Design a protein around this nucleic acid. Sequence first.
RNA 1: UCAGGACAU
RNA 2: UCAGGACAU
Lengths: 59, 59
Amino acid sequence: MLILTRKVGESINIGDDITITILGVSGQQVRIGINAPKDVAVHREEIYQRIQAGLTAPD
Amino acid sequence: MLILTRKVGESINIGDDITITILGVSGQQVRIGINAPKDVAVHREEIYQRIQAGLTAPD
RNA sequence: UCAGGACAU
RNA sequence: UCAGGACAU
């Protein structure tokens, strides 16, 4: 686990092929971006539960 | 490239072993959390430049 | 901004 | 906002 603080217009990184960018905020909402190869997956925590059910590609 | 707009307390996911959470905001600041194995790296964009200089894991 | 592989900025 | 593998929340 890691925790750190950032502000709009800055970035964070993961692995050696992933990047994250805080595009800005709108009230409690926070617009964020993600940059990774299609060799990996990325979704909301909601959609992730449909995938970790036992797969990475639908029927 | 992906873009999301979610608020404090929400979560997002990457790969099959990474998770992200938005702990909250303060004006323009945005405190964030990350959860991944030590088999991968995670730092802010500032520290990432010390790593991509020729490596991906500290001493 | 209700969910996408797009900064719509 | 100071930099860590910790929500210090």
